[PDB]
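fwd from M.: "can u put these together and see what the complex looks like"

so here's what she sent:
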Amino acid sequence: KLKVAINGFGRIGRNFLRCWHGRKDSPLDVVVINDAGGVKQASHLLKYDSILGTFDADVKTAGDSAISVDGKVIKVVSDRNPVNLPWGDMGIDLVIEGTGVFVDRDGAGKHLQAGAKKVLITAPGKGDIPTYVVGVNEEGYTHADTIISNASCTTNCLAPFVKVLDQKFGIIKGTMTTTHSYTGDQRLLDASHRDLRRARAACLNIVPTSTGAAKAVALVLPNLKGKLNGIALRVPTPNVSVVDLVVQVSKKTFAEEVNAAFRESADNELKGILSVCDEPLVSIDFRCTDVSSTIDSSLTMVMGDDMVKVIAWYDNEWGYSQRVVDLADIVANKWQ
Amino acid sequence: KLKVAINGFGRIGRNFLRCWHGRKDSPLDVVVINDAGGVKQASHLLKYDSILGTFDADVKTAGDSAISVDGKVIKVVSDRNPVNLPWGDMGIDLVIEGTGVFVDRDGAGKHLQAGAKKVLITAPGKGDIPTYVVGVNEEGYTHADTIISNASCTTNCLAPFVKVLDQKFGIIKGTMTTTHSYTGDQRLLDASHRDLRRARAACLNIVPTSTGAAKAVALVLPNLKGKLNGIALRVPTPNVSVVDLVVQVSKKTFAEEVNAAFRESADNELKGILSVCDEPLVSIDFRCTDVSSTIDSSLTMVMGDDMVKVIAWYDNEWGYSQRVVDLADIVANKWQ
Amino acid sequence: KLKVAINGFGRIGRNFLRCWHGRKDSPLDVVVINDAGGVKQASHLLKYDSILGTFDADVKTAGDSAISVDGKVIKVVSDRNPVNLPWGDMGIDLVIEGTGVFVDRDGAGKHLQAGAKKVLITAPGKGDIPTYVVGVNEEGYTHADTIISNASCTTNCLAPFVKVLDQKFGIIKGTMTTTHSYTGDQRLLDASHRDLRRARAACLNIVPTSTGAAKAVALVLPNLKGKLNGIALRVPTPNVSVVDLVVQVSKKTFAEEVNAAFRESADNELKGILSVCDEPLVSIDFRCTDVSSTIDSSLTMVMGDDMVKVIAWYDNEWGYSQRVVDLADIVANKWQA
Amino acid sequence: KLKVAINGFGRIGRNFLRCWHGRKDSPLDVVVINDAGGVKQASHLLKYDSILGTFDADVKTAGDSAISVDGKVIKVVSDRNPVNLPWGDMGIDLVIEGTGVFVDRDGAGKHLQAGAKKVLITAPGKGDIPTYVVGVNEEGYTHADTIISNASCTTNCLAPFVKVLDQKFGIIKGTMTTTHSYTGDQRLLDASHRDLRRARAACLNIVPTSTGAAKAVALVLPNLKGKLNGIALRVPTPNVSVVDLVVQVSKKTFAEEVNAAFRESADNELKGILSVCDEPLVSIDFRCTDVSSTIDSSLTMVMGDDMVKVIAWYDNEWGYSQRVVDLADIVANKWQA
Ligand SMILES: NC(=O)C1=CN([C@@H]2O[C@H](COP(=O)(O)OP(=O)(O)OC[C@H]3O[C@@H](n4cnc5c(N)ncnc54)[C@H](OP(=O)(O)O)[C@@H]3O)[C@@H](O)[C@H]2O)C=CC1
Ligand SMILES: NC(=O)C1=CN([C@@H]2O[C@H](COP(=O)(O)OP(=O)(O)OC[C@H]3O[C@@H](n4cnc5c(N)ncnc54)[C@H](OP(=O)(O)O)[C@@H]3O)[C@@H](O)[C@H]2O)C=CC1
Ligand SMILES: NC(=O)C1=CN([C@@H]2O[C@H](COP(=O)(O)OP(=O)(O)OC[C@H]3O[C@@H](n4cnc5c(N)ncnc54)[C@H](OP(=O)(O)O)[C@@H]3O)[C@@H](O)[C@H]2O)C=CC1
Ligand SMILES: NC(=O)C1=CN([C@@H]2O[C@H](COP(=O)(O)OP(=O)(O)OC[C@H]3O[C@@H](n4cnc5c(N)ncnc54)[C@H](OP(=O)(O)O)[C@@H]3O)[C@@H](O)[C@H]2O)C=CC1
């Protein structure tokens, strides 16, 4: 019931399509896809995936202008410049901007120029762009918004439980470290990169790198402005990441009280977004989890009664993608 | 000038031998080695190493009771039970206990029974065993000690800079997380293990696990008793690890002041033990570093003036081994 | 029907249970497991798998003596010594031996001493033990065999299509190499091992190691006695392997014909055993394939009309386990004691 | 002596510089580098290497136009378009082309348009470009060749011992497979790529991919035209590869004899090019070996007296680079313009 266009059929673009496919009675209708790769490439890389495994659905080529998924057809275009896109011609209502290169208002606006009605950036938007994290501040959304951001994968894992920590105990200050799976932005072997660390062989190193999730939390949760900072450590795993948040709170507490606070939310206002796991699991066990963040309850610690340490897992590819579909769903429900 | 016996020719045992080999005018004399493996195995695995690379020295078999290194001969025995060892027969002064199974007083004492004069455990000693970290409290050592511990690799990285942080700013409370390279204690593929997490495929997961380094710091630095706790995250790298320490201090400070405090120590009382790196490096760049801990100066952060976050690198195998040689050197210099 | 006991709940042991669980109207009944690790461990590792993913079934501990899967309770014992197992007491018909330590008659025989009626080794048997490969020589099995072998994962991948090659082109001689994923027998980090190459860090090296798969093929395809040989190259992947076979055939041929020969068999004789893939895929795309061998068609080459090169993929864990289930199924159907 | 310019400071480009740096009394003088990434980047990546380790030399930036290694200053420029390079202005004699994008005459020719006197491609040339393999056909090079190719890392590993086999046993036909470490052309995570197999996550798969190494061997050893073929299997290791060759030889032989043949050549003809290792080693033990091919003796097999299987290791980065240095050395010694 809503014409959606996928701009950039990469990890997020493909995960998004498969996430959408699995939804029941979806308000969205993916009609077109744009990628620098060919049509035979789109179908091949959509059907076979080194992380999600083979797609359980009939995926084949539909000529040279489209692909087929369980019968349904989806147009396939290719144009590095968004302005030259048939968005208007097709009456595209929403464009899923997942190229990683059109994050500001100028770049992302080119979709609007091409005739698109609205755009959702699958990443933090630079400049003055409204960003939303489902379960944290999506209510602030309004159809009047033509360009919106769904933040980063890390921000979607952090915001949900930081919100609980702040409402229940009151965060004073804090730092975070995310031991993150490597991503396409890194190099397979030591090679040129503006970030001299991300330039190093990704499957061979623990790669420290900056993160904006810490400060970005303040966007969706104003009360946290200037209260958090952090860094990231990219490690040799292909997917699934973990956040290590340490905060000083105003109200004294203890490990199990903190955990119970998370469970209360997980069962109510954050059901489907936040989860608490009591099992002694490892990263691979969290692949394909729909929630944005899963607290490893047994790792929660409190030092000196007011320094809380929380460990939360998140499938950076799949989990975030479900959040993209959710935000897109909201756009379709609060339309015109 | 001191008969040393290597009990357990594993990662630490082999690294220790190669570390010792590189020392100039060493007070130590490695005369014997004991391992569950054969003689041809000891020489092969000593000469070829997937982490340290090929040993630059002539290593060959010396029959069925010894091996040869650059000409020098070293006896090779094999006996799972230490009591049945020719320590007394050879007049062994010090035994480098690196089997990982004789960590308490009963088990490690068996070396003394076999005729050994003293034992140095290359790991935290369980029970009432004096533990020392060079550069932190080695002065407390006395020849009267028959069984001593050199703590863990993590404790040797943490203690050095925690000592500086506490003397210069006064630690109130803190938590730590070590993103650690996998070790032999983990499983290559999901298999039986008392620790249900360490039981999972090590090259495929981020594996949370308990650590005693946090509490162990209190042994070598009494003032820290009950002030720190922490966890470990084993990741898919074969060697080199990193500590992420967050502490609340009494004296307000800022990132560069903290770094300068580390440099001051690195240049004086902690020269050779602690180091500060201003380069934007990654884990592989710290392999074979002799220091116990290297602060990544650009990652240092301070939140709200009294919450300090420090990131320090350490070669868990090689770096720790140099510390083993150092403690052994001390034992030889404060002998009888 | 058949009372089955699993001895050694490792990769194959757990892949076996899950393989069995997926079968419909199984003639087998897994009633007990001998896990050295314990009940909590058996339940946890069965539920969570780094390769197979989370078992889609309700798995929990049952008291301190068993576990349950979707309600079916399975007893759990722990004795490293087979002779002390309550096999006779429980009336165990078939013991699935997947410890990797009781691969010879004296070892496996211990299960018989404990009362089990028959033992099936999930690996090449050592010595005079009959070995079978489903799709190649299973018909040779008889209820009289007290100790059988299901061969290795490599033999199960090779034998099937080698059989097609031989009967269709006549194999004169040949050699093969398997680029194999690492396994529990290798070392995570450089450490003691009888095989000085397997002693080296598995996730960091290309590790050459001997293989009996080539010779083992003669045990199931007598016609190829002393005609094949080869080695293995253990590489840094957790599961799924690939065999590279180069044979000199009597009949001059060409790639397209060789592939066509495989397709015929795959569609008939070896349906469910051998497969042919025309897609340009990679190792991971073959995880959880039930067949024991999948020919990569586009890689088939023929040099000088008589030198054939074949590349076949195989899930050394899941595909092999499915075969162990099939062989056990034959033991049940051929039973009648 | 020879004014050398490095175009493309990638894995080979940097391995080259370090290889050159280790040489004594080199006839080459590296005076400029064209790095798209910049000066700080060229200096940093030259100093810190995830595979080679930290360069044991004082490496720093020099102003904003150059870098220096142990005091020797090397200019750095950045133009993705070769035609605009100051080659003529600097009087560059030889351009080391390691970008992987100017592998044909029209591409490499751009360096000549910019004033360089000669171009040496660190990869198979596309089209009518003469290609050489040090130890096999270097003597065929003449100063008249303006654009040459040093072939691929796989061709440099195969050719050398294939030459020994052919002249000592006569190769009738053959096929090979190289279990190759991944390279920058593969994708870190599933992503767009002309080669649908190379598009797949490199550290997570066994990736089959085509190779020209077999055919390329004919360019340096004419005698083997149309006699060999093969493929490549990219595996999860960062560096070092291994070639698996299976050939049918005219003269009946046996493993011990084949190995002995390699040792003779290694000790004479191909000393410093071919080597023979009797140790049971693994991939990592061959990092930084100067030879371009090391025969794993204990793995040599012969099936039916005429089917020979050879396994040879090679550091596709460092060994190849050392060869690029040698070929450049021949350009200098054979110069005289
Ligand atoms: N991976 C993850 O865990 C998450 C990523 N994100 C964000 O999503 C974005 C993309 O990331 P990710 O999918 O991971 O990375 P990928 O590189 O896998 O996806 C980016 C895609 O953009 C495509 N592309 C680039 N330019 C164009 C263009 N101009 N027109 C059409 N297609 C184009 C690229 O095609 P080609 O390959 O041909 O160059 C590539 O397929 C980034 O903003 C990232 O931060 C957010 C959450 C999670
Ligand atoms: N790796 C690292 O980063 C560090 C490890 N350590 C500590 O050092 C110890 C060993 O660790 P590590 O070297 O890493 O592990 P390894 O398993 O590589 O070394 C342990 C060795 O003990 C040998 N061994 C076991 N029992 C005996 C015995 N009874 N007699 C003779 N030899 C025996 C084992 O032989 P076999 O393999 O035949 O069973 C193995 O070679 C542990 O205490 C560990 O915590 C401390 C600092 C750093
Ligand atoms: N992995 C694969 O791809 C294939 C393996 N195989 C074969 O199957 C066998 C096992 O291999 P795999 O599962 O891979 O390896 P694992 O090591 O994962 O399994 C072996 C199991 O045997 C258990 N065990 C050892 N001794 C005993 C005992 N005495 N009593 C009870 N349990 C015991 C071990 O327990 P613990 O860990 O407590 O020591 C371990 O769980 C081998 O014969 C192997 O060659 C065949 C086909 C495929
Ligand atoms: N790696 C190995 O094992 C071997 C590789 N080779 C061959 O060498 C070549 C390069 O391979 P490799 O070093 O491995 O790969 P890399 O990608 O690491 O090196 C290629 C380099 O070319 C640079 N580059 C691209 N275009 C230009 C340009 N127009 N001007 C200046 N610099 C440019 C790239 O810069 P940037 O990253 O900024 O895009 C990159 O640094 C290929 O021909 C390859 O087949 C041969 C033997 C061995």
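replying to her w this: Helices of chain C lie at 11-22, 39-47, 87-90, 105-113, 153-169, 213-220, 255-267, 318-333.
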